């Protein structure tokens, strides 16, 4: 098991064809989960499942620069279920991050932060039991 919030170093940042895999189990009655791919204090890619925003489940994605959130990208396809084991895979591609959950494509998020090799940490937080977090090149 891993303690949440968890920080996964990404040495030398990210690069296309790098695949980051997060395994865990969603807590019962979960409210929120977040992945934060960070460049220093900035958040290049925030991926944030919300289980109860106005009684809807939604995925919110955004970028934080100089402590300011930008424009949210929202996805109502919501593959997580409270109490169940999940896999999040984030594949860095040349123009976007591509996310698949439980082996089904979920969303893409275009790169706003372009210094990919400075996106050197992934933070994992929220209402999960975290089993592992790792990366590989495909």
Ligand X SMILES: OC[C@H]1O[C@H](Sc2ccccc2)[C@H](O)[C@@H](n2cc(-c3cc(F)c(F)c(F)c3)nn2)[C@H]1O
Could you list the residues that contact ligand X (CB under 6 A)?
A: 32-34, 46, 48, 60, 62, 69, 72, 125-126
- 73 labeled part of a ligand binding site: yes
Closer to ligand X at the Cβ: 54 or 136?
A: 54
Closer to ligand X at the Cβ: 71 or 114?
A: 71
Q: Give, as one character, the DSSP assignment of residue 97.
A: E
- 69 labeled part of a ligand binding site: yes
8 A C-beta contact, residue 33 and residue 48: yes
Q: At closest approach, how far in Å is the CB of 65 from ligand X?
A: 12
Q: At closest approach, how far in Å is the CB of 124 from ligand X?
A: 9
C-alpha–C-alpha distance, residues 4 and 17, integer Å: 27
Closer to ligand X at the Cβ: 53 or 118?
A: 53
Distances (CA, A) of 121 to 9, 28, 116, 136: 4, 27, 11, 15
Specify the pairing of strand 42-53 against strand 33-39.
antiparallel
* Cis ω before 27 (30° cut-off from 0): no
Closer to ligand X at the Cβ: 18 or 87?
A: 87
Q: At closest approach, how far in Å is the CB of 94 from ligand X?
A: 24
Q: At closest approach, how far in Å is the CB of 123 from ligand X?
A: 9
Taken in order 24, 87, 75, 121, the sign of the CA dihedral is: positive
What residues are designated binding site for a beta-D-galactoside? Answer: 69-75
């Amino acid at each position: 098991p891993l303690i949440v919030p968890y920080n996964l170093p990404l040495p030398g940042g990210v690069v296309p064809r790098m695949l980051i895999t997060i395994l865990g189990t969603v807590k019962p009655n979960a409210n929120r989960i977040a992945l934060d791919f960070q460049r220093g204090n900035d958040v290049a890619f925030h991926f944030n499942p919300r289980f109860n925003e106005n009684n809807r489940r939604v995925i919110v994605c955004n970028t934080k620069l100089d402590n300011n959130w930008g424009r949210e990208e929202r996805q109502s396809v919501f593959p997580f279920e409270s109490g169940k084991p999940f896999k999040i895979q984030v594949l860095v591609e040349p123009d976007h991050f591509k996310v698949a959950v439980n082996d089904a494509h979920l969303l893409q998020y275009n790169h706003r932060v372009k210094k990919l090799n400075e996106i050197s940490k992934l933070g994992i937080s929220g209402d999960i039991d975290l089993t592992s977090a790792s990366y590989t090149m495909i």
